[model samples]
Target: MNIFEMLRIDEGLRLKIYKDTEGYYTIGIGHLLTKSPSLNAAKSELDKAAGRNTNGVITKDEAEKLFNQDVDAAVRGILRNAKLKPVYDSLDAVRRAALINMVFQMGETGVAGFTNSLRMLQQKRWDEAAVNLAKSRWYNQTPNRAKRVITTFRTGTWDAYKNL
Candidate 1:
């Protein structure tokens, strides 16, 4: 039950998986949208990060200006939430991307805020988390993202998140 076995890592996504101040092993996107920090910065910060060459390994320092340290805290909180935690447990890399995407949209409190939904996930209620995830207000809040993530979570795949 090492969680990474369930996660799918592609060349495209950048994950900052770290042991945080809270002592939780957490994951966050080093680049949001394109590259840059993921949280607390403005659209301008994104524009700067997006300037990097594609296929380039965007470093944390360059992106940190925009997607700041706050993003890391946000990522940690979302992962620690019980509902999402189980999904993290069950997920492979593809599912992880989907979850991380959700983290970007929902923030830590919002995704973890799904008390009942999180409970179902903890119970190994895949179908329930799937149902809750799909039907959740927070689920599809990011337009097609909810559908995309939920679809991947339920079906055990997210092709877009695969192969870089």
Candidate 2:
């Protein structure tokens, strides 16, 4: 019921950079094409992150940056709305990264819907969290990627299945 959670559920999430119906580049949490500065910055950011000229294609960096920005904002909102700073701060780096990755793909609200999963995460029950993750619709939609993320969540190592 927190605003951050609400926003996460209400807003769309995009894991990869995609072309909008208009053929312009769009990525992450429904970020659409605007004027030049933002788009061009993402373009250049993609170029630098990819280490190659994408010829105006948006890359993972741009998608992640957009996700990161929203996540940062959502943190503040979560703190204000739920006063859960202690819980948030207690998460380890890998757990935090997993949350960020999920948020990047699901938005804040989407991940929040994973009540049992989040509870398992809060309890440091990695195996349970992985099981909970595997049972979700998202897992059904992206089995390979879900397995990779679930493996990471369960094992605390950067293991990507099928090369991610």
Candidate 3:
């Protein structure tokens, strides 16, 4: 499966600005405005979507642009981090996608904080890694999506995405 499309499905895009469950003002495919690359660009697009348009809206191209940027940021974050790089390198395509998916949602810092899980993943201890992941606060916040990601890690199958 395409990791980008998987992320899009997991993130659930919106053209207009709206507050996320955590109350941060976000737009597009889970683009947290405060966590963006360019505050000025975000502000202008937000205004255009919020005020200039009849309804708050951004084009698909615009949203996809933001999604691509966010994904790039997440991917770079994994490779550059001291703790995450080696762990990322040892994984196969399926597991690598799972790792990237986690990082895409929670940021490198958040995923790196999963000390036991990362260790388990690097060691190829799939069940143990899943156990550690399942217990996270991140799991509780979005159970189904988190469950699917965890199952993907455990089984090395795209069937996780299929169930949802």
- Measured on C-alpha atoms, candidate 2 has an lDDT of 0.59
Best candidate per TM-score, number? 3
lDDT tens per residue, model 3, 91-139: 9888888888999878899999999999999999999999989988899
Q: Kindly provide the TM-score of model 3 when superposed on the true structure, using C-alpha atoms.
A: 0.86
lDDT of 1 at 43: 38
Instruction: Put down candidate 2 lDDT per residue, 22-134, tens digits, no spaces.
Output: 45555555564443446676666556654677655555566556655666765664454342443456677655655655654555677767778777777889888898889
- Arranged by lDDT with the best first, the candidates are 3, 2, 1
Please provide, for model 1 over 1-164, each residue's C-alpha lDDT reduced to its tens digit, 9 standing for 90 to 100.
Answer: 21222222321224343333223323333233423333323234444445743233345555343355444554576567766766667656655655665565456667767677666655656677788866665544443546556666666664534443
| Every model's TM-score | 0.48, 0.55, 0.86
Return the clash pairs for model 2, or none.
8-109, 9-109
Residue 18 in model 1: lDDT: 37
Q: Choose 1 or 2, whichever is better by lDDT.
A: 2
Model 3, poorest ten-residue lDDT window? 48-57
Steric clash count of candidate 3: 0
Which residue pairs show collisions in model 3? Answer: none
